[PDB]
């Protein structure tokens, strides 16, 4: 009766047999080749560590996790020590205590002495480990060693005076990141970590580097000295910039968000964060609109009251448009707002509502057709990848890191179709043509053979193809590949479709697909929640444009009425991510100015416009949600789609023989939040 | 430049408004600044000369909300620096009696004109709320009323977007009719009835006048250039008002009569001797304007606007709004 640390679901790959070891007395059961450190963990005792991370390789480098294993000589490094059946582990014996005391003595001997300026002071492992396990007095007077600090782009500044030679950053940058730039060079006490040609680090996950590095040397530049940790509160939310819906924790003080950091979730993003998201808050603070505005006929903007704004918009809506009413659902919006907007429009009678990046074409709706079937976790079990029209390094960076994790674990041949790009794992480039996709759905391109000679293949279609005119042909060619290669078996459904927004899944789920094509052209009253509608341009000269949005930067100069809303860190909505898993964010900081939530503003607009919505509380909104699509109220559990892709094609001729266009560019100026934000702007200016 | 509510009511909530309250040292000034700072808004009060007259309203608000500033009148630079950063301006200045170095005309008319012109200068204001009286055009005695009507006209003219309140006579915890009558009765031979003894007025609860002022101050886009009056909840003759005071003070009423000749011949020497080299006593109950506004009935015009158009009429002048008399 002893629960593991934090709770830790052991695997038991072969549950018929498993060794047992004595940890500090009482026994514990352990799988075949588990390390002494994880055995002690299962037994429920934490061992001090510096150079061991559960996601990177092992290296007996810090020499602090020492324990004594009776039936052995004096010292033993806990990590990298494979457990043996019956070894007599011991952690709190004078031998181990003195070992830890001495090692901490050496570290703090040749450490710098600048805690009260070195942030991570209050979070530092080395600090807490010394205070809890090390001695209380130092005996040292002579001069220490100091090195010069280093620059690694405007994300990770380093005062290398305190690089205690752990090689955590090196092992991360060479295993998970993919780009080999950081490296440990020198000798003896004179040993630094730094790129030898003063280059920068043009990769994501560098924020993950600053989280990995325990002692406060590699630290985020835009969070230079703004706060210690004990000062600010953390709210556990999800992400909306990427499409994976990463699980993060917003650390905020007062009405200001200071930083965001990953939080463990062993199903979506292990413990990492893509570089885009960690620095996406500064502009969320920086640029903002916080008053309902009306365009005065001199082309200017005046701040009006909610009564007047809603009255004028409802009046003109009822006034003119008989059948030409269209509504664009935002790129970063929640199912609540989407269902409220669709209900308001359908009660208005005229319905052309559609999501952000969902194609104007047919875009049939089968959950197995438009969600990533194999969960990201299961993605670690593939053998042959078939990325088509996708650069997952730039979109869904966490899925890219997962694919890299698979290729690192066991070499898995990966074939990629589309434009030239710089993959970081030994990729095969198969061409740029859906014509090649046809040939491989047929017999040429011997890579198809690999599929047939494959166990657990994976075929990943990027959501950028939804906007292409001929999508049913692509999906039908993929269907034929699947049928002929046996990749849809009931044991394993490896036919995945990525996404490149946070609202795309819930939009396609509720059914926001445009009933026609020239909707924006023929319209006269457009209701926007998100920008870009093609170069914000297809809207005609005379058209009532109402931008019910937040953080206005683009298309606002086209808007006719402006309604401020609450960002993704100030409200409670439901976002669905590509594997079909529906999470919910939580409020962290007060709304800015006098903006209101999206479903609230929609319901108020409906009432003042006459036809009202039968619901006026989040509970009834989610009840309507249960009526239209249930998992969205079955939040926080992925509900698979146990129906095949038996769609009906409508092109039946060819795949239009046009190359695959690039779906997302610059990786930072997308996502209006970051775009009107800033650190992403200078990262775009430099780290490219 | 529309302000923004940035709180939840109560003290220490911003709600935007910054108001300069000229005259915020006496009765209506006290009540209105109390209402404003309780709602949550910065207030700048000027005081002519003292160190402790505004001191009380120093406490009716969070830190740095109420600010007493400087010597107010007879200087354009002083008034400007007092209105340096206002959002709204509320004017209540005005006595009920002339003092040699001042005069009804001078104070009311010329100071209203000065305030209007300096607001034009600092044309960054939003609401100019001037409170004058239940007094009409120069169609009535008590030259204060003539000058005050001319001031009403000139402030409407120099500020077409203004609001001029015309409240009736006020009764409250410190008024100038009930307390004088109680003092007079408790002192010696009981009260006089001027004019006839049955002259009609509409006394009004001061807290409710202040609530009307706050209402018209907020009044989201509904009345930005209006000039109207604030009556009371019921018509009161002066005899019946005195009987109300007597029933509430628990004493025996006695009235003095033959009002007009004694009134005129005993209130006229004050002005003469006044303009004749040192200050003279205050008109306890023989005020000329009292004589005039009591010889002419002024109740309600029933014509322009009212409480009913703004907000519900005062509670009643029997239970609470006279409950302050129990001090006797």
């Amino acid at each position: 009766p002893r629960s593991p640390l934090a709770g830790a679901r052991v695997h038991f790959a072969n549950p018929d047999d498993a060794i047992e070891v004595f940890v500090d007395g009482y026994p514990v059961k352990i799988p075949k080749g588990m390390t002494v450190l994880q055995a002690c963990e299962v037994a429920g005792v934490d061992i001090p560590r510096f150079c061991y991370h559960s996601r990177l390789s092992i290296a007996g480098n810090c020499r602090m996790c020492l324990v004594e294993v009776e039936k052995s000589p004096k010292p033993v490094a806990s990590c990298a020590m494979p457990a043996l059946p019956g070894m007599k582990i011991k952690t709190d014996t004078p031998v181990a205590k003195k070992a830890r005391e001495g090692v901490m003595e050496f570290l703090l001997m040749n450490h710098p002495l600048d805690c009260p300026i070195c942030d991570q002071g209050g979070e530092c492992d080395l600090q807490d480990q010394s205070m809890a396990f090390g001695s209380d007095r130092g005996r040292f007077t002579e001069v220490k060693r100091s090195v010069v600090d280093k620059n690694l782009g405007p994300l990770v500044k380093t005062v290398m005076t305190r690089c205690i030679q752990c090689t955590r950053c090196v092992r991360f940058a060479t295993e998970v990141a993919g780009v080999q730039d950081l490296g440990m060079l020198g000798r003896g006490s004179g040993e630094e970590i730094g790129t030898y040609v003063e280059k920068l680090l043009t990769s994501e996950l560098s924020g993950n580097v600053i989280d990995i590095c325990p002692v406060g040397a590699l630290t985020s530049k835009p969070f230079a000295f703004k706060a210690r940790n004990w000062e600010l509160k953390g709210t556990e939310t999800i992400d909306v910039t990427d499409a994976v819906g990463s699980n993060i924790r917003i650390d905020s003080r007062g009405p200001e968000v200071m930083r965001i950091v990953p939080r463990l979730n062993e199903d979506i993003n292990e413990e990492w964060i893509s570089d885009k998201t960690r620095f996406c808050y500064d502009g969320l603070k920086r640029q903002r609109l916080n008053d309902p505005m009306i365009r005065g006929p001199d082309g200017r903007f005046k701040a009006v009251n909610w009564r007047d704004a809603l009255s004028v918009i409802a009046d003109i809506a009822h006034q003119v448009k008989p059948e030409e009413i269209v509504g664009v659902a935002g790129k970063l919006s929640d199912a609540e707002s989407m269902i409220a907007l669709k209900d308001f429009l359908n009660r208005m009678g005229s319905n052309d509502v559609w999501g952000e990046g969902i194609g104007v074409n047919t875009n049939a709706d089968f959950r197995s057709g438009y969600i990533m079937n194999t969960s990201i976790a299961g993605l670690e079990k593939a053998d042959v990848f078939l990325l088509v029209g996708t650069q997952p390094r730039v979109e869904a960076a966490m899925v890219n890191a997962r694919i890299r994790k698979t290729v690192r674990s066991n070499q898995a041949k990966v074939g990629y179709i589309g434009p030239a790009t710089d993959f970081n794992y030994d990729h095969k480039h198969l061409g740029t043509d859906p014509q090649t996709l046809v040939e491989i759905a047929e017999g040429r391109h011997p890579f198809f053979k690999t599929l047939s000679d494959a166990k657990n293949p994976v075929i990943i279609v990027g959501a950028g193809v939804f906007e292409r005119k001929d999508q049913d042909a692509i999906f039908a060619a993929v269907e034929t590949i699947a049928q002929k290669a046996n990749v849809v078996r009931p044991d394993w459904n490896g036919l995945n479709v990525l996404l490149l927004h946070a609202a795309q899944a819930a939009a396609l789920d509720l059914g926001l697909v445009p009933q026609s094509e020239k909707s924006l052209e023929s319209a006269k009253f457009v209701y926007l929640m998100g920008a870009d509608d093609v170069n914000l341009d297809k809207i005609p000269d005379d058209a009532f444009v109402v931008y019910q949005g937040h953080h206005g930067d683009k298309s606002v100069y086209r808007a006719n009425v402006i309604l401020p809303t609450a960002a993704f860190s100030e409200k409670e909505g439901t976002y669905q991510n590509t594997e079909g898993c529906t999470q919910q964010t939580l409020p962290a900081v007060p709304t800015v100015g006098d903006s209101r939530d999206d479903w609230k503003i929609i319901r108020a607009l409906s009432e003042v416009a006459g036809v009202r919505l039968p619901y006026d509380t989040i509970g009834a909104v989610r009840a309507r949600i249960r009526n239209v699509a249930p998992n969205l109220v079955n939040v926080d559990e992925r509900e698979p789609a146990t129906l095949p892709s038996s769609l009906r094609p409508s092109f039946t001729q060819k795949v239009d023989t046009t190359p695959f266009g690039t779906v997302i560019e610059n990786f930072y100026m997308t996502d209006a939040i970051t775009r009107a934000s800033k650190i992403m702007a200078q990262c775009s200016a430099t780290l490219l | 430049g529309h302000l923004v509510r940035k709180g939840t009511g109560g003290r220490s909530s911003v709600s935007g408004i910054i108001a300069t309250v000229f005259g915020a040292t006496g009765f209506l000034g006290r009540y209105v600044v109390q209402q404003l700072a309780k709602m949550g808004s910065q207030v700048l009060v000027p005081f002519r000369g003292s160190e402790d007259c505004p001191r009380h309203l120093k406490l009716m608000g969070d830190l740095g909300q109420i600010v007493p500033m400087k010597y107010n009148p007879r200087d354009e630079s002083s008034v400007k620096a007092v209105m340096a950063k206002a959002n709204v301006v509320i004017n209540l200045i005005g006595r009920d009696y002339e003092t040699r170095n001042y005069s009804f005309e001078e104070v009311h008319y010329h100071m209203a004109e000065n305030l209007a012109k300096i607001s034009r200068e600092h044309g960054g204001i939003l609401r100019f709320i001037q409170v004058s009286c239940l007094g009409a055009s120069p169609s009535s005695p008590s030259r204060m009323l003539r000058a005050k009507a001319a001031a009403e006209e000139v402030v409407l003219r120099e500020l077409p977007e203004a609001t001029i309140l015309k409240p009736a006579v006020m009764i409250g915890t410190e008024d100038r009719i009930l307390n004088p009558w109680a003092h007079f009765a408790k002192k010696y031979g009981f009260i006089p009835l001027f004019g006839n003894g049955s002259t009609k007025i509409q006394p009004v609860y001061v807290v409710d006048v202040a609530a009307a002022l706050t209402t018209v101050l907020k009044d989201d886009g509904t009345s930005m250039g209006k000039t109207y009056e604030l009556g009371g909840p019921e018509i009161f003759t002066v005899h019946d008002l005195a009987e109300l005071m007597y029933e509430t003070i628990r004493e025996w009423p006695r009235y003095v009569k033959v009002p007009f000749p004694i009134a005129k011949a005993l209130a006229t020497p004050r002005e003469i001797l006044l303009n004749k080299p040192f200050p003279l006593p205050t008109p306890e109950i023989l005020n000329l304007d009292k004589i005039q506004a009591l010889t002419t009935d002024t109740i309600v015009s029933e014509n322009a606007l009212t409480f009913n158009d703004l907000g519900i009429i005062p509670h009643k002048l029997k239970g609470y709004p006279v409950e302050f008399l129990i001090s006797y």
Partner: peptide
Amino acid sequence: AISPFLKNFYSSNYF
């Protein structure tokens, strides 16, 4: 009569 939801919505957004 404005369906008191709206009456709250015109005021602050914390109800």
